């Protein structure tokens, strides 16, 4: 039959589905939603043979099992047991695009268990065996007999073995394909893996059952009234004495409860369902769920005769919310929402596509921990748990059918084929069965990555008309078709158009106003965190923040798609595509996140925590205007902290408790903050802590924070006329310069300051030299590749113009002795192929103080591609243990991504200069520094810089961070300019004009002395 | 044109049509129909089928078709000839003064009906003028009403020709034949004969 | 397989749908509507044999013509040749409600031809069978080799037979079953045939 390569069979035999079920027999386990006798776990040890292909599977596997099988832990994915090789393909399908075939070498996974049933379970009832997860087909048979068949990688495929299970020992065989026509619609862009991945249960269901509820919540103008409404199908014997029962409890409390026979109400000339029954529970002041407050209530659902025996019971959690567009805005209970979202895939570093509780948990509460509120399944239905977990601690939810066909020629080729029409709809549907009733789902999302198609039109409909409650988006097409409730586009900028034909991604802000447009528009994917990314985040929050109708958006991406490899020694490191052999393959473009796989964050994570805050502010004169961005709580779990510093040392500081109500504002006024005695610039730092432990963060957690510059005092005392003056020796190849116990020596062949002492201890391993590029960014890079260069690319721009081989040529180099001081001038031109790039003229003025100013006035070919920094690097010889700052920190910050960044005095252990991300490039920068301390070495100035133990050009030459090996000495970088780093996309150029080097003429000054 | 899906004898009449494992089957009648016949001139409507309820399905298929080929309306009678999968009001029998309050499916009067608080859309009658046996009593009262309200725009009498079939008696003489004269049981008698005209077209 | 009790199964190795066509192979045929050469009726005289289930059907029928078959006219409703009733119901399904199954005893009609095909069909191109509609539905078997199935009475079921073909005589088998899991969307108010 071949139903692996036919798009019409998607299952054979497969239960409906329906909400999670556990067929408890005593209503308060039901309530408390404790563990069911009635519903078991098989996962464990199973016994595992791969083959080439299922014509390679010998008959005796169905009989019995094979010597040659391995006993492996399932869930799994079997390229993490190293069966075969994981894949990592972006866009392009990894097998030959040619539907509905797939490759006849078709990896095969055979599973199988014995295990026991006991003879209660069969004397009676219905046994069913629940698959959560299988990728991406597969066969079942049970003591030898074929049961049936699955696709659908991502929701789970549940079959009745009542038949054909025996009391005491049984064997189930699970023939697992990897690829299968259902492949065409998994096109997401992460690892391609398969195995039986979710979940193995078996439920125990009383013949005469609840097949499915849904639970519906509809509320008066202004919520302090809502009305419960769940509908309960059953299937077995119908009998008048039957009845159901539906109850309600806020905690221990029963709040209210309802009880009917079974036989709905007329539906049509033909009457009504005679095996459902709704029932409606009235409400009074419900508690509302929101992710800021996700109050939840119990819903117990029994089945049972009219004389009080149990027949069964089933429950959920209910959260009290309305979700609704209205007037062009997405409303929760009936407030317009801020989506402070991210897309989270299901990847595990060492497991692949295995999910567990507890690397759920860490994520949700890093996630809040971190200001964000909602999450997008991208791109598939998740493991159920998620879902619970979402309810119970409070994200708004994007569920997301498992369709992607991105890899289509054009993309919509199989979406608008109606022959594609029933697999897409199940795909959807079953989706919603199963997840209608979870309170954290707001929005359904139709897949990804698809185009338009009328396939998604009418499941767009399909949805509208089975469940109103929540609005539909989609964003193939130009995410602004007629299938989505949402304008939802993937990278488009916030002011700058890019009008692609057909599917252009016009500004946000212009977006909205397109004549005739009314829609919410929230990006379902933007600011995409590839390595040292997000530069432009802020941007997106002022604009969100002054437009109503802009609503936010979803992130790319939560983690890392990086997985786990070990060298000879055992000793373990991330790897990217291509690093299995896997080819052709995409590279680092798996690796995306906001947080590295092991869950530790990257650097961006504090930008987008610092502007998704719940609370903003203003200052005035002594006054604090606190405003809050809740909709519904009161801010009873924060204090107002605030702290008054010169120059880094503490002047003053306080604590204010805040209450705010929801939206409301607070003015605080700050104490008399007499002046400071002293030079320097005085700074306001105020943090919101909550002081209270919250299911989801520890006492003392900093939600918020913000400063301000107050008084400035100039320095205006001259000097201190000091002794010693510096003395200059001449020799025709240098320029020494000499003070006490310190000297400098500068080469007059190459023009750079060569050398430097501190009594017989040389400093330098490498002269002091301009820097005018850096170890490209992913952002840098994009798609370029050498075998197929993209000339647009920043760093194909860069390569081209010979920036990164240019040549400098010393113009000038001269040496002056002054009154007090040696005056050293220098000018140099970089050059390549005859024209010049870059001319750098210098002054180096050392005085009797021992410090060396140095000038920097650099020109910039106005043709040349903007570069990357302008600046200076050297190689010092010695390596310290800490580096201090007076500058923005403490974590690595760009001129596009510094927002979070605070002015202060920072001190951290010199390995925190360096950001280890997976695919190495210039990383670590700190920028709007006035003063740095590493060694005995003191710089001042305004600059930004990094320090570290890779020079930039081991790190573009380096594709894995584990690869790299610490340089003799420290490489400093100090720069009095650098290009931002962008982000709104990794594919095309992305950083502002703004962020861009092109003002021709650049002026920096440097003070560098020893202490 | 009208999709080959009937599924009247269901209880309720929904039962399939709403149900989501019979999308697919249902979608291959509508889809391979417009495939089929999109390019005649003739076809000016399309239709989602006949009594077969109101399901989510008709829902589905009532929006591929619009997405499909905006240049036909849609139209369905199911469910109460007024859902969201139906551009014509186009009930079935309903009177031209007298309501028949049908709980939820009411068949109202059709100068009512186009009234109706929100309502707008055009109405034709997907059938009306039972036309078996003796019978068009009151044709006339449905045209003095379509003449005079511009938006009932006619309809489509029910129906062109009896299904009566030919048998032989003991001196091999024809005969028509209806429901239970084949042995058939149970059957619905004469009620396969409705026509303006005899099964050989002379006219009633 | 049982492909006539699953909902899930409408056909099997069918081809997509389109407008009428005739292939002609010149351009003033086509557009005076003229007969096409590269369009053949297959309309006439068939050989038929009832049968009261799929399961009674005899193997031997796939490669062989049954002695005991009739020679009957196609196009045509075997309750019109006397085989089996012709059922009048309206609104009650003609058959037990209990999707989507159907009566065992379901009458299965035997069908088959012998026909020939020219060499210059084959040399080329493809050769295609089309069934303008045939109820409730069927399993297609060309020179004993099994061809596809479909259901939807009222629509035309196409086949590519270019691989099963012979220059000269071939011989097709329809097995066309009275009920199948598609009578449950055929409750129409008329005779079951
Ligand atoms: C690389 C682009 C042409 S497609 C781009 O690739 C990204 C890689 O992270 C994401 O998968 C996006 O969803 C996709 O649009
Ligand atoms: C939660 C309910 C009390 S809302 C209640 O519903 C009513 C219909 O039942 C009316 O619409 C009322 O105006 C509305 O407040
Ligand atoms: C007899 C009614 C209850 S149903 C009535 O039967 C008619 C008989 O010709 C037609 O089939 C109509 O379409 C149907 O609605
Ligand atoms: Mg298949
Ligand atoms: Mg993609
Ligand atoms: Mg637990
Ligand atoms: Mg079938
Ligand atoms: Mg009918
Ligand atoms: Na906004
Ligand atoms: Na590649
Ligand atoms: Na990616
Ligand atoms: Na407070
Ligand atoms: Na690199
Ligand atoms: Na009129
Ligand atoms: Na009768
Ligand atoms: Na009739």
């Known amino acids: 039959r071949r139903d692996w390569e036919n798009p019409g069979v998607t299952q054979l035999n497969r239960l409906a589905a329906h909400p999670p079920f556990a067929s408890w027999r005593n209503?308060?386990?039901?309530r408390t939603d404790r563990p069911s006798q009635q519903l078991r776990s098989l996962n464990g040890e199973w016994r595992f043979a791969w083959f080439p292909a299922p014509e390679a599977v010998p008959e005796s596997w169905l009989e019995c099992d094979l010597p040659e099988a391995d006993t492996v832990v399932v869930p799994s994915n079997w390229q993490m047991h190293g069966y075969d090789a994981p894949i990592y393909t972006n866009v392009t399908y990894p097998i030959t695009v040619n539907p509905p075939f797939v490759p006849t070498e078709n990896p095969t996974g055979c599973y199988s268990l014995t295990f026991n049933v006991d003879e209660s379970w069969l004397q009676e009832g219905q046994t069913r065996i629940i698959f959560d997860g299988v990728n991406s087909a597969f066969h079942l048979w049970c003591n030898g007999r074929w049961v049936g068949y699955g696709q659908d990688s991502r929701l789970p495929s549940e079959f009745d073995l009542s038949a054909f299970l025996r009391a005491g020992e049984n064997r189930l065989a699970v023939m697992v394909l990897r690829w299968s026509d259902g492949s065409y619609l998994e096109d997401q862009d992460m690892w391609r893996m398969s195995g039986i991945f979710r979940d193995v249960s078996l439920l125990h269901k009383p013949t005469t059952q609840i097949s499915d509820f849904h639970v519906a919540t509809r509320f008066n103008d202004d919520f302090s009234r809502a009305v419960l409404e769940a509908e309960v199908q059953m299937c077995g014997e119908l009998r008048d004495?039957?009845?159901?029962?539906?109850?309600?409890?806020?905690?221990?409390?029963?709040?209210?409860?309802?009880?009917?026979?079974?036989?709905?109400?007329?539906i049509d000339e033909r009457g009504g369902y005679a095996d459902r029954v709704t029932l409606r529970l009235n409400v009074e002041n419900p508690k509302l769920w929101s992710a800021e407050i996700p109050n939840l209530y119990r819903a117990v659902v029994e089945l049972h005769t009219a004389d009080g025996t149990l027949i069964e019971a089933?429950?959920?959690?209910v959260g009290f919310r309305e979700v609704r567009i209205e007037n062009g805005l997405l409303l929760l209970n009936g407030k317009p929402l801020l989506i402070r979202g991210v897309n989270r895939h299901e990847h595990h570093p060492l497991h692949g596509q295995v999910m567990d509780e507890q690397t759920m948990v860490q994520d949700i509460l890093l996630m809040k921990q971190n200001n964000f509120n909602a999450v997008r399944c991208s791109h598939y239905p998740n493991h159920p748990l998620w879902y619970t977990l979402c309810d119970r601690y409070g994200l708004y939810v994007v569920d997301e059918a498992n369709i992607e066909?991105?890899?289509?020629?054009?993309?919509?080729?199989?979406?608008?084929?109606?022959?594609?029409?029933?697999?897409?709809?199940?795909?959807?549907?079953?989706?919603?069965?199963?997840?209608?009733?979870?309170?954290?789902?707001?929005?359904?999302?139709?897949?990804?990555?698809?185009?338009?198609?009328?396939?998604?039109?009418?499941?767009?409909?399909?949805?509208?008309?089975?469940?109103?409650?929540?609005?539909?988006?989609?964003?193939?097409?130009?995410?602004?078709?007629?299938?989505?409730?949402?304008?939802?586009?993937?990278?488009?900028?916030?002011?700058?158009?890019?009008?692609?034909?057909?599917v252009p991604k016009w500004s946000i802000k212009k977006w909205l106003s397109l004549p005739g447009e009314t829609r919410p528009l929230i990006l379902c994917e933007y600011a995409h965190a590839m390595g040292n990314s997000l530069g432009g985040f802020a941007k997106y929050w002022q604009a969100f923040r002054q437009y109503p109708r802009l609503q936010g958006g979803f992130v790319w991406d939560w983690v890392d798609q990086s997985l786990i490899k070990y060298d000879e020694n055992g000793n373990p490191w991330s790897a990217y595509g291509g690093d299995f052999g896997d080819t052709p393959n995409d590279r680092q473009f798996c690796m995306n996140g906001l947080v590295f796989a092991d869950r530790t964050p990257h650097p961006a994570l504090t930008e987008a925590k610092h502007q998704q805050q719940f609370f903003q502010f203003r200052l005035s004169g002594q006054t604090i205007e606190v405003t809050s961005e809740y909709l519904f709580r009161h801010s009873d779990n924060e204090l107002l902290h605030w702290m008054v510093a010169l120059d880094g040392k503490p002047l003053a500081?306080?604590?204010?408790?805040?209450?705010?109500?929801?939206?409301?504002?607070?003015?605080?006024?700050?104490?008399?903050?007499?002046?400071?005695?002293?030079?320097?610039?005085?700074?306001?730092?105020?943090?919101?802590?909550?002081?209270?432990?919250?299911?989801?963060?520890?006492?003392?957690?900093?939600?918020?924070?913000?400063?301000?510059?107050?008084?400035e005092n100039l320095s205006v005392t001259l000097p201190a006329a000091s002794h010693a003056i510096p003395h200059l020796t001449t020799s025709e190849m240098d320029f020494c310069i000499e003070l006490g116990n310190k000297r400098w020596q500068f080469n007059r062949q190459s023009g750079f300051l060569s050398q430097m002492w501190i009594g017989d201890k040389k400093q330098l391993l490498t002269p002091l030299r301009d820097?005018?590029?850096?170890?490209?960014?992913?952002?840098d890079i994009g798609v370029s590749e050498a075998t197929r260069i993209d000339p647009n690319a920043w760093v194909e721009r860069w390569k081209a113009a010979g920036h990164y081989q240019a040549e400098a040529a010393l113009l000038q180099c001269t040496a002056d002795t002054l009154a007090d001081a040696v005056l050293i001038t220098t000018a140099h031109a970089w050059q390549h192929q005859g024209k010049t790039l870059f001319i750098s003229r210098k002054t180096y003025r050392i005085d009797g103080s021992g410090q060396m100013a140095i000038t920097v006035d650099v020109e910039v070919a106005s043709d040349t591609?903007?570069?990357?920094?302008?600046?200076?690097?050297?190689?010092?010889?010695?390596?310290?243990?800490?580096?201090?700052?007076?500058?923005?920190?403490?974590?690595?910050?760009?001129?596009?991504?510094?927002?979070?960044?605070?002015?202060?005095?920072?001190?951290?252990?010199?390995?925190?200069?360096?950001?280890?991300?997976?695919?190495?490039?210039?990383?670590?920068?700190?920028?709007?520094?006035?003063?740095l301390n590493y060694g005995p070495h003191q710089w001042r100035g305004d600059f930004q810089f990094?320090?570290?133990?890779?020079?930039?050009?081991?790190?573009?030459?380096?594709?894995?961070?584990?690869?790299?090996?610490?340089?003799?000495?420290?490489?400093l970088n100090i720069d009095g300019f650098h290009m931002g780093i962008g982000g709104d996309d990794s594919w095309s150029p992305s950083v502002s004009a703004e962020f861009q080097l092109s003002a021709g003429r650049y002026h920096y000054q440097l003070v560098w002395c020893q202490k």
């Not at 002081?691 to 900093?702: F, L, M, R, V, Y």
Request: net charge negative.
């Open 865 to 931: 591609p903007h570069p990357a920094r302008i600046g200076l690097n050297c190689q010092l010889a010695q390596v310290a243990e800490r580096v201090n700052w007076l500058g923005l920190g403490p974590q690595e910050n760009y001129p596009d991504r510094l927002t979070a960044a605070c002015f202060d005095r920072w001190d951290l252990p010199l390995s925190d200069m360096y950001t280890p991300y997976v695919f190495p490039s210039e990383n670590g920068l700190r920028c709007g520094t006035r003063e």
């Open 405 to 502: 066909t991105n890899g289509m020629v054009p993309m919509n080729r199989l979406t608008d084929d109606p022959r594609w029409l029933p697999a897409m709809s199940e795909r959807v549907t079953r989706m919603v069965q199963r997840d209608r009733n979870h309170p954290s789902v707001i929005i359904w999302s139709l897949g990804n990555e698809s185009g338009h198609g009328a396939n998604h039109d009418a499941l767009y409909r399909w949805i509208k008309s089975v469940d109103p409650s929540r609005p539909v988006q989609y964003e193939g097409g130009g995410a602004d078709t007629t299938a989505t409730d949402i304008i939802c586009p993937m990278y488009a900028r916030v002011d700058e158009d890019q009008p692609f034909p057909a």
């Open 771 to 779: 820097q005018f590029t850096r170890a490209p960014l992913d952002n």
């Open 946 to 971: 990094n320090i570290s133990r890779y020079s930039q050009q081991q790190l573009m030459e380096t594709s894995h961070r584990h690869l790299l090996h610490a340089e003799e000495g420290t490489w």
């Open 27 to 30: 209503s308060e386990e039901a």
């Open 314 to 317: 089933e429950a959920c959690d």
């Open 241 to 266: 004495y039957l009845r159901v029962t539906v109850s309600l409890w806020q905690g221990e409390t029963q709040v209210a409860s309802g009880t009917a026979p079974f036989g709905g109400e007329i």
């Open 653 to 711: 500081s306080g604590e204010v408790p805040l209450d705010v109500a929801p939206q409301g504002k607070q003015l605080i006024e700050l104490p008399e903050l007499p002046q400071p005695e002293s030079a320097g610039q005085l700074w306001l730092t105020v943090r919101v802590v909550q002081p209270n432990a919250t299911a989801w963060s520890e006492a003392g957690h900093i939600s918020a924070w913000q400063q301000w510059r107050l008084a």
